[PDB]
Amino acid sequence: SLKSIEVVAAVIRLGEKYLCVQRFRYEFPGGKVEEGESLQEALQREIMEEMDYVIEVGEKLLTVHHTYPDFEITMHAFLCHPVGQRYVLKEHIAAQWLSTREMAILDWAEADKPIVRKISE
Amino acid sequence: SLKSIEVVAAVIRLGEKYLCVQRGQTKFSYTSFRYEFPGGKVEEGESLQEALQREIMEEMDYVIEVGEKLLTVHHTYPDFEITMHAFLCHPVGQRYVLKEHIAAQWLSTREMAILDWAEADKPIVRKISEQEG
């Protein structure tokens, strides 16, 4: 079947606050890379599609590798800087701007925990 | 999008032979891709059968009829959700086209035991093998 699964996550910062979504646990916005896309263009499309939010992808924060026997799965987190000033919540997906100490009291998705851990350090 | 994917696989049968594919070329002259059943991802707004039919048509130019579900393989990885659906399929069209670096063989279940199968496809092979052999 699938040779690889690449997932991208956007860590969007304004001030001391990070865009955290609850779509249930909390997560960073992002999604899967389509075949033929780079990781950055996958992330910019994914954020536009789900949130109408125009961002610039910056430096890569971390790569989460896995050793699962059946599928090769890799997650790529990028520090992102917003260009637009508009984001849309297509219904019942709530989003908050939170500081790191607000983020630590929260139920985060398992895939996103390394990013939350890193944002602190 | 959600961190969850649905995969479909076609078990194409002709007589007592099944279509087994090898999709790619490695860098090394002493390594090669393992075998697998043709298929791919289910895109949003598609049923499992229509995603399969589309995927077979796009990779192989092969008109197929999707029949009964043979098995479902679920994975419960902490970081990502994957479901595989294998369906028994019957050819309508009489020609398929293999692109660059793609090989395919029509094999019995006994001959299928000779090959190296992708780890994800191994439950499917075992199911096919348990029912005749």
Q: Which CATH number fits domain A1-121: 3.90.79.10, 3.40.605.10, 3.40.50.1820, 3.30.460.80?
A: 3.90.79.10
Instruction: Using only the alpha carbons of chain A, give its radius of gyration.
Output: 14
Q: Which residues of A touch B36 (CB under 8 A)?
A: 1
Residue B109 to residue B132: CA distance in whole angstroms:
8
Q: Which residues of A touch B7 (CB under 8 A)?
A: 1-2
Report in angstroms the alpha-carbon separations of A73 from A8, A99, A101, B24. 11, 29, 29, 19
Residue B122 to residue B51: CA distance in whole angstroms:
21
Q: Do A1 and B120 make contact, defined as CB atoms within 8 angstroms?
A: yes
Looking at this protein, which amino acid is placed at residue B44?
E
Residue A62 to residue A83: CA distance in whole angstroms:
22
Residue A107 to residue A24: CA distance in whole angstroms:
8
Residue A99 to residue A104: CA distance in whole angstroms:
9
For residue B129, give both structure tokens.
Answer: 């093998």
Choose among A109, A102, A105: nearest CA to A26: A109
Residue B12 to residue A86: CA distance in whole angstroms:
49
**Partner residue facing B9 (CB), from A1, A64, A110:** A1
**Partner residue facing B7 (CB), from A2, A73, A110:** A2
Residue B84 to residue B71: CA distance in whole angstroms:
8
Pairing mode of beta strands B64-76, B17-23? unpaired
For residue B15, give both structure tokens.
Answer: 């007589």
Are B25 and B33 contacting, i.e. CB atoms less than 8 angstroms apart?
Answer: yes
CATH, domain range B1-133: 3.90.79.10
Looking at this protein, which amino acid is placed at residue B37?
F
**Partner residue facing B80 (CB), from A1, A7, A23:** A7
Count CB-CB contacts under 10 A for residue A89.
13
Experimental technique behind these coordinates: X-ray
Are A75 and A109 contacting, i.e. CB atoms less than 8 angstroms apart?
Answer: no
Residue whose structure tokens are 């860098």: B27
Are A78 and A9 contacting, i.e. CB atoms less than 8 angstroms apart?
Answer: yes
Choose among A86, A14, A15: nearest CA to A47: A86
Q: Which residues of B touch A (CB under 8 A)?
A: 1-3, 5, 7, 9, 23-24, 36-37, 39-41, 75, 77-80, 82, 84, 118-121
- Resolution for this model in angstroms, one decimal place? 2.0
Q: Which residues of A touch B (CB under 8 A)?
A: 1-3, 5, 7, 23, 31-32, 46, 49-50, 64, 66, 68-71, 73, 75, 109-111
DSSP string, chain A: --S-EEEEEEEEEETTEEEEEE---EE-SEEEPPTT--HHHHHHHHHHHHH---EEEEEEEEEEE---SS--EEEEEEEEEE--S-----SS-EEEEE-HHHHTTS-B-TTTHHHHHHHH-
Choose among A101, A111, A80: nearest CA to A16: A101
Are A90 and A54 contacting, i.e. CB atoms less than 8 angstroms apart?
Answer: no
Q: Do A66 and B79 make contact, defined as CB atoms within 8 angstroms?
A: yes
Name residues whose C-beta falls within 8 Å of residue B6's C-beta, 6 or more positions apart in sequence: B41, B42, B48, B51, B82, B83, B85
**Can you tell me whether residue B59 is helix, strand or coil?**
helix
Are A94 and A25 contacting, i.e. CB atoms less than 8 angstroms apart?
Answer: no
